[PDB]
Amino acid sequence: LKTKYANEIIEIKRIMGEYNLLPDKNSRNGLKLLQKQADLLKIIMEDTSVTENTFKNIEIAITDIKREYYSHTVDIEKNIHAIWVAGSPPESISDYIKTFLKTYKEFTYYLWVDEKAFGAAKFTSVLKQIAFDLACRTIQQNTPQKNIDFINLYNEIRKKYNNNPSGQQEYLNKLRELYATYQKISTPLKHMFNSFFLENMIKLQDNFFNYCIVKGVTEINDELRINYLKNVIKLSDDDIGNYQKTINDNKDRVKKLILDLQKQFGENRISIKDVNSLTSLSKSENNHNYQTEMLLRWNYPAASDLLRMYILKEHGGIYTDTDMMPAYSKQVIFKIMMQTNGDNRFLEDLKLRRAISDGVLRYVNNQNIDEVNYNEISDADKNIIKKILTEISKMPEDSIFTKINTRIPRDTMPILRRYHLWPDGWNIRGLNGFMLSHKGSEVIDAVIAGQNQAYRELRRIRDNIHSEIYFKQTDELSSLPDTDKIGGILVKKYLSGSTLQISGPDLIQRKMLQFFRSRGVLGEEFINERKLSDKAYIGVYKTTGTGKYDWLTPESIGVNDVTPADESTWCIGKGRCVDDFLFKDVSTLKTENLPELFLTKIDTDTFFSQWSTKTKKDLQKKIQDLTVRYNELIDSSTIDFKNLYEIDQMLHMIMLEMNDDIAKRSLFSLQVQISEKIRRMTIPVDNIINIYPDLHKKNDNDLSMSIKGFLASNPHTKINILYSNKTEHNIFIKDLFSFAVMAFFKKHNENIHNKIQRIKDEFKEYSRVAIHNIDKVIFKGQTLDRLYHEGYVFSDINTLSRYTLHGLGITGVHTEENLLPAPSSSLINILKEHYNEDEISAKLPLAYDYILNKKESSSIPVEILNKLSELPPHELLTPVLGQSVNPLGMGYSSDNGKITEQVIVSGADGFDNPISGLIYTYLEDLYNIHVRMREGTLNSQNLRQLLENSVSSCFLTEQSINKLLSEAEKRPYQSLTEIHQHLTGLPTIADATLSLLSVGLPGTGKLLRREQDYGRPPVTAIQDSTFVLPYNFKGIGFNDNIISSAPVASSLHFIAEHAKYTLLSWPEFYRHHAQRWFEMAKGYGSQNIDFHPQSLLVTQEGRCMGLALLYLQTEDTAHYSILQENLMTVSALHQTSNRDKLPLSKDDNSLMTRTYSLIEMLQYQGNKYITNESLLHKTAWNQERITLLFNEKGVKRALISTPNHTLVLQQLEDIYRLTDPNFGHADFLSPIDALKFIEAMIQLTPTLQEYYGLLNKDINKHIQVHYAESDMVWNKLLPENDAGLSTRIQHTTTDRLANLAEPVAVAGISLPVKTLYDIGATLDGRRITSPPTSEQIPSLRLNGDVLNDYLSRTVLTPEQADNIRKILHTQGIRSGTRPIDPEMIRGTQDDLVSSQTRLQRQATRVKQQLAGVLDTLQQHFQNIPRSSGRHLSVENIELADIGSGRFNLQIRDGETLHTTSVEVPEVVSRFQKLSTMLSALPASGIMDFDLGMSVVGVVQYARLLQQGHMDIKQLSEATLGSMIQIAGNKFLNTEGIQGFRLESAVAEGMRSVATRTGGTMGKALSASARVLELPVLETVLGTWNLYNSVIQLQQATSYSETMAARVQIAFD
Ligand SMILES: [Mn+2]
Incomplete structure (x- = not known):
């Protein structure tokens, strides 16, 4: 290996040098170098051809490196931090503090006091009251078939206790009895009472944050809270007095305690630190989670879970809770061991250690020993403990307790370990009640990031609009903050008054485990069995080779957790019913100032009720003008950006032209409603994915895997691999020129051609895979063309490419990384049975290898593979289809809440996309600045002139121009992203999109930007992620976990190869059956039968789900009629476009594409819903049962599914409307007649029965009915953005042209513009939509196909035939269309x-x-x-x-x-x-x-x-x-x-x-x-x-x- 590993050997030399040249080796950078060289040694040893001597050398090097890492330890700061819960009686606290001050001599005790949150308990109690009342009201209204005894009793008790406010205890006890009654309610009702309460409280918190925005405050105090309460609920002076009394009482208590302890121990020895003096409290990325925790907490007497983290990060030292006691010394524990004849039951049983600790507390602080609470203890144990206490009370106060080791490893936080003798055995767990750390520790950063992520996931319930409600997930200790359980805990605490934790010890342990795993090799001793080890804790008691643990000389000196004042000990006594409560009547809520929970319109009579006279007489006229447009915008099912721009701009101007406060608040409420509407209306995304590979990495296996996964996820996905040859060529020239600065051409050309040909050939047989050359679709005049021509080489070029290709019409999901489709819930459920939540992410690559390819590995059980093979690949993966993005038209991947540019999900074709135009203009401006800086000819005035007449001029501030000029002088050649960063001060163009939008959307854009600091997701961030990074399998969403909340698999309906009907012959089916349809409907009692057959889907793929769901959205007769007309128009357009192969105008084409994308997404979602029993109840066809559902269970909508088709049953007004997409609808007085008619219609006619899939089958077992538990579920599932298909009558070009009454003179004769368009008048290859000007009349041409169709459809008069002949003669037929012989044109x-x-x-x-x-x-x-x-x-x-x-x-x-x-x-x-x-x-x-x-x-x-x-x-x-x-x-x-x-x-x-x-x-x-x-x-x-x-x-x-x-x- 000495040849292949030679260069990396050189690398190791350099890292060794970096070890040598360290002024402070006890620092983060040195440890980073250590892990880097350790990983390099890992790489060396991983080679197969390694001798035993090399193994031994590597092993001793690893041991030396680990020892060097372990030697670098930090002495923690000499501080002790304790957080003062406002509701804490000092008499039970002070003693403990004295203890911690008598043993830890050289330590300063800081009591962290939050002065401005002294009254916050009452504020959150009022918020909880309002939220629960709203949840009860919505439950009662949403289930009107029956009255709820829980709600009745709850309203009864509240109203009755209103008479006697002083009876808080009388009220709390009766509320406990009420909870006992509530426990017997139905489980779905419990799930709805758990989802609502939580969502309502999050909404109220967001409303408070919005009020903080509108008041423009920076820090939140009690006065702000009280004013908010007075602006949301009628507050009397009595409750303000109660609030102030609580605040004053807390101040007096804390001052008295601190004064007493400072009189004893000195001035500087123990001191008070204000909570507000922390940089992290106001930090933007912490998202003000401290304020949210104050509301979503169930551990009342415990301290805050997030403040200790900030305190440890910013100060360092030791954090302790109030009731912790210092650990017993060696001598005392030895003596108590020998004085009780070897009975270890004293050192294990909690009920006895409590009494012993109470005695020691009383002795150390010289209090009476005999006064120890001795209940629940027998007399013999009482006597021996008494002698124990009298014997210890002789030992020197000093030699009674021990301390701990203040030398901790660098960037590690020790955590106390607790051992408890439960009746079932030994309970061992880590506790966040006693921590050690030092200032600037980095594991604290990981824990804080984890806490923020956990709060984001908790808020996901309200953040995600189309989020499911009914998941009956069993208790599984999920890493997810499982919303249902948290809501249940919250309701239980609100009702009764007294496990799982969002940011408790469990989350801390998980995050430290993850960080230590991320550390690398040198952390192997801090992790055992893929779990936190014994060296990451303090207080671990080694076992003495037996069942029990020896209590002498533990591995690390701990802290006496068991105490007579443990949070779970005294709570048997304190009722805590007055310190944190404020009973306010909720019926007097002011709904008009609550845009989050109530959507209201401009009622001109009552809107100007609290406005002053002058503001009224100045602004009421303008508001009245806004009234109709704003109500229309709110009630619309689509977003039109022109009216939104106008309304919001003039609302912002009106706001700026005012000095009032109440009117400012009402206008801000309108802006909030507008922003929420923008958030709600999501648009679909096309089933297209575009991967922009980097053709320079040594392996393309990831690319092949990604393509295979996206092909297998859905059989209709379109994949485009866009690569640029010019970019590679210019990169080659740049490399050759850099080499020349300080032959291969054929090799490089062969390499690139081989990679491209290989990817082409591996997916040659698949038509959905398209290998594209980017410099073949871009125009020569585009910015990208100039960028390639000049030799742009900077690594961000591909990102620019993505933006350009989105402006060229290539929609879908653009990405650079080799994305993989997210695993579906079925695959996760399969994997869970043999793995825990923390190994699934590790085993997912093997599962994907077995699904996409067919390889199997021994690392996974065989039964898993057999279970995986039984399901289709498309049922285990999530396709690009069915997704949605923000109406602004672009979404971005998120990373810890910060949107990045790994993935760009760009809307759907035919939908409005303002961000497209904005980024187009911005890219042009950046290019102009770059080219003018290239020659060095840029100065301030030129820079101003370039950005004039552009939105980007909003970034023209003095500091920005100064930085731009400085950087231009330093280095003229800078990449477009560097120019962007200089000009804006933002990381990515994705961040600049919102600022560019604020230009045309002022006030609302600023509000949406401000909401990012207050917990709300960015409006341009995708929440649910259907993609996972190939190397770590983490979702790219904002607030999602791919393992615990994976999306359900969607059922795919596959049809036979031969189609019974095609588009040409489809109307045969309607024609031959319409008459019998009508006869059956009329004979079964129908009084209103309407025929609006569809022609959009001639095949049964999707079982006509999409259309059905559309008909299910409507709740009113008028909306239904509007939808029917729009659907008929779109169907006619579809027939014109494809049956006749006729061109359409741009507007009609866009309308058709919008409707088709919406229909396909709706069909996918419906097919997914009907197969998953958690969302919609599914029942077999039975008339009596269905009548019972429609008469007793309050069901208003239902989907009747045959094997190949879907019908819709509704309850509009007082009639039941059965809708068949192919035949229109019928109206029935009672459900039973509708059911009889459905049975007869699908059963009697033979061709109908065969086509629907019910031939030779029993209809009582093949017809299913899907319904919802409550009607609101449909409001939650169905998308709100219908593209206007349900509210406004879309107009085709013909209808618009028919309104114009001015004729157009062509060829010497005058004919209406409508007729000119009908005969196919086109300008330069595009059908006319407006009256052509006199100049363009000679340029008109006649489309042959359109004219032929018009002749075949119309019976012209002889004069009209003459006119058409003349027009065709003087204009001619456009080339490439059907030639028309003038003899054909005649009239009758x-x-x-x-x-x-x-x-x-x-x-x-x-x-x-x-x-x-x-x-x-x-x-x-x-x-x-x-x-x-x-x-x-x-x-x-x-x-x-x-x-x-x-x-x-x-x-x-x-x-x-x-x-x-x-x-x-x-x-x-x-x-x-x-x-x-x-x-x-x-x-x-x-x-x-x-x-x-x-x-x-x-x-x-x-x-x-x-x-x-x-x-x-x-x-x-x-x-x-x-x-x-x-x-x-x-x-x-x-x-x-x-x-x-x-x-x-x-x-x-x-x-x-x-x-x-x-x-x-x-x-x-x-x-x-x-x-x-x-x-x-x-x-x-x-x-x-x-x-x-x-x-x-x-x-x-x-x-x-x-x-x-x-x-x-x-x-x-
Ligand atoms: Mn406690």
């Missing part, structure tokens, strides 16, 4: 309009039917085993059966393979109808005009085909023509005339029909027959030949559309 008179319309309708119907017929023929022809080539060559067709359309088709395959069976009754039945109506025409006064026209069209199409004279498709079309001819011959040739032509017979029949009944119908029939008799028109044959020659080859469509176009040609 008034009397022949109905006939022409019916003919066009029949043409469409025949197109749709023949499409299905030809698909059937292709399917029948493809299942025939065919050898090499396409020589099927149908020998002979013959019509066999007359009633079912049986055609015997001999196939002359050459191998005598003959399939004489096919069922095509659509062709035969029309001719049967025509013949039977012709024969009985003299005896029937009925004439079917539509049937005649359809038959005429079919025979004309067959004539064109056969006159025109070798794969499956064209052969099947020729076969179809043959069967049309044969059926006509069979039905119209009554006698066997050899000289029989179908056209002549059909024409003669039409002529006889026309001559039997006169009129315009007869004239039209005669004209059709006349056309049939004569030879085909020259122009007709010309257009047919032109199509079949050039147009079919030009188009890439399948063959069905070409056949439909030909039959349309025939009908025209």
Whole structure:
């Protein structure tokens, strides 16, 4: 290994030198160097070819390095810190302090006192009262089927006790009894009472922080709290007096105690330190978690969990709790051991150590020994303990207690260890009640970061809007602050008044374990069995080779934890019912000042109630103008940025033009509501991931693994690996020039080409993987093009690339690191059964290796692998689909609350994206500054001119320009991110996006920026992460844990290869069943039946879930109608876009893309929900049960799922609306009729039953019903941003143009703009949306396809036909579209309009039917085993059966393979109808005009085909023509005339029909027959030949559309 490891050997020399050149080796940097060289030695020994001598040398080097690390120890500062809980009686405290001052001679006792939080207990009690009352109100209102006895009794007791406020104890005891009653409530109700209470309290805390923002205060005190209370609840003077009395009493108590102890021990010996004098308290990243802890705490008599951390970090020394006692000395413990005849029960039993410690306390402080509480102790033990105390009371006060070791290892915090004799055995655990550390310790930083992360995870309940409520997770000691358990603890404490911990000893132990693991090799002695070891604690008692532990000479001297005043000891006595309580009536809450919990509109009558007269008379007019727009913005289901910008800008201006305080508060409430709305409306994300690899690392295994994982996560994901060749080329030139400063070209080119070709070939067979060259999609005038041209090399270039590719239209998730899809809940549940929560993250790489690839390793049990193979890969991983981002259009990965640029999730196509434009402009400005600095020609005035007319000028401050000029003079060539950092003082452009937004969104943007300092997530941060880093498997979200809260797996619905319907023939399904649908609905009692069939999804993938969920969002008739119209419009647009292959305007295209992305995300989410029993209750189909649900259990919405389809049942108003996406909806008076109709509809009709998936199946066991426990669950699951599909009627370009009444003059004639757009008027390759100016009129062009469709749909007047012919003649047909022959364009008179319309309708119907017929023929022809080539060559067709359309088709395959069976009754039945109506025409006064026209069209199409004279498709079309001819011959040739032509017979029949009944119908029939008799028109044959020659080859469509176009040609 001396060759490969040679260079690293050089490295080790240098690290040794770094060890040698250390002024202070006892420092962090030296230890870092030590771990670096230890890891290098690890790398050396990991090589397989290592001799035994090298192993021994490495081992002794490791031992020496470990000894050197362990020798570097720090002597802690001589301080002792104790936190004074406001509610602490000094008589029980002072003694302990004296003890700690009599043994620790050279130590100063600092009592940390928070003067401004003396009254905070009452404030949090009032907040808790309000939150619980709100939770009770919402529970009662959300479950109106029954009244709750808990709520009734609770309101009863509160209201009754209002009479006697002085009876607090009477109230608290009755509340304990109330909790005893509450324990018997239903478990789902308990879960809702646990989620609500917590969410409401977090909301109230956030409201208080918002008030702190609006008052512009910097530090929070009691006066601020009292003013907030008076502004949120009516406060009388009595409660203010109570608050002040508590504050004064606390001040007097603390001053008296400190004065007494200072009189005894001296001035400087014991002192008071103010809590507010800590830098960490006001630190922004601590997020004011100290204030939040004051509210979310259940350990009342205990001290704060976060203050001790700050104190240890900023001061160092020893932190102790009040009731800790110094450990017993060696001599005293030895003597008590020998004086009790060897009975160790005295040194283990808690109830006895309590009495002994009480006696020692009384002796040390010269108090009466005989007064020791001796209860629950027998007389014999009492007497022996009495003699014990009398014997110890002779020993020198000095030799009664011991001290501890104040020399601790550098950057380590010892933690006391506690041993307890429970009845079940020995309980050993670490305690945060006694810590050692030193100032500037770094493990304290890790613990503080962990505490902040824990509070973030706790707040995740309210942060995540679409977060589930009902997870019945069992108690598992999860690292997650499991929200349900914490809410339960909080409710229990609020009700009764007296385990799990957010930031207790458990979290501290976890964080120290993680940090010591991160330390590396040298920490191996601080971790044992992947857990905290015995050397990370103090007080560890080694066992004496037996069951019990020897109490003489412990490994480390501890602290007497057991004391008569332990928090869990005296609490049997103190009732604590007055120190921390404030009973305030909540019914008088002022809802208008609470935007978090109540969304209110501008009620102009009551809004200006507390405003002063002058502010009213100045600003009321402007507010009244704002009223309607602001209410519209709030009530909208989408966010339009123009109105938001206008409203917010003018609200901010109004705020700036005011000096009041109440009106300022109301306007700030409006801004808060706006910001919350911005937070709520999330937009979907496209199923696209774009990885920008760094093509220089030695291994690409991570890239392949990431691509495989994202391919396996979902079968529709699109993956784009964007690499740039110019960037690599310029990097090569830069390396060669740097080498030249102080041959390989072919090697480098081969290396890059080989890597790119290898990644291309590994995923060659997958179409979803696209290897892209970035310098092939960017415009030449773009900033990136200039960056490549100049030779930009700086490492941030790729980040810029990402931003550019988002502005180019490439949406999705852009990333550089090799992301992996997050593991689903199923994989985690599988892994949990054989692993703990801390090993799952370690074993996940092996599981992913087994899922994506097929490798297995012995490090994982076989049963795990077998369980993993039983599930599909897409059921174990989370795909990119189903995600959502902020409406501002960009989200970023988070790292401890700071958003970074590892992952950029950029909205969805078609949605508004302001950040795109902002970053585009910013990148341009940075480029301009960079280029002007490149030549050194930048000065202050130029810098001002560059950024004018730009938002980035908001960063133009004097210090920023000064720094920019200084850095420009120091080094002219700086990367764009360096320019950004100089200009703004921000780390990343992601941080600058919000500041750029504030320009156009002032006030709201500033508010959202200010909320980041107060616990609220950044608005541009993704919360739920579906990705994990490949090297550490940590989610990239803000407040998520991938292990304990992994997302549920989504069920994927897979359908058969053959599609029963395609887009062309889909309307057949609606047409043939609509009438029977209506008849069934009307016969089952329906009174309102509406038909709005959908055409968005013609296949059953997703079981039409998406659409159904949309119909489930509506709660009102009006919203339902608006949604129905919008959906019909989008469906028509879809048919126009893809069935006809017609271009659309930009607005319509964006609307279609928005609706489609929303539908796909909704379908994914719905399919995920229905399969997970924790969220929606699923029941088998039973009419009585469902009626009981809809009548008794208060269920208002339900999803009825068949195997292949989904129906929606609602309870709008007082009627039950059953919605079928393919058939519209029906309205029923009672649920039972709706259920009967659903049963009949899905059961009776055979084609319906087969298509829905219920053929030959019992409907009582294959139809499921999914419903919610409470209606609010739907409000929690369904997204709020509908893209306006439910509130506002989206308008297509045609509707907008139809409103304009000004005509446009083209080619000398004037026609309306709507008609000009209809005929396909395009400017430079884009359909017009506005009246063209006179200059652009010559540039207009006519789209051939749109004009052809318009002609085939419209019955023009002769004058209009002349106008269109003239316009086409003077403008021409746009190149690449369908050429149109002017002879085709004609017009009809008034009397022949109905006939022409019916003919066009029949043409469409025949197109749709023949499409299905030809698909059937292709399917029948493809299942025939065919050898090499396409020589099927149908020998002979013959019509066999007359009633079912049986055609015997001999196939002359050459191998005598003959399939004489096919069922095509659509062709035969029309001719049967025509013949039977012709024969009985003299005896029937009925004439079917539509049937005649359809038959005429079919025979004309067959004539064109056969006159025109070798794969499956064209052969099947020729076969179809043959069967049309044969059926006509069979039905119209009554006698066997050899000289029989179908056209002549059909024409003669039409002529006889026309001559039997006169009129315009007869004239039209005669004209059709006349056309049939004569030879085909020259122009007709010309257009047919032109199509079949050039147009079919030009188009890439399948063959069905070409056949439909030909039959349309025939009908025209
Ligand atoms: Mn305690």
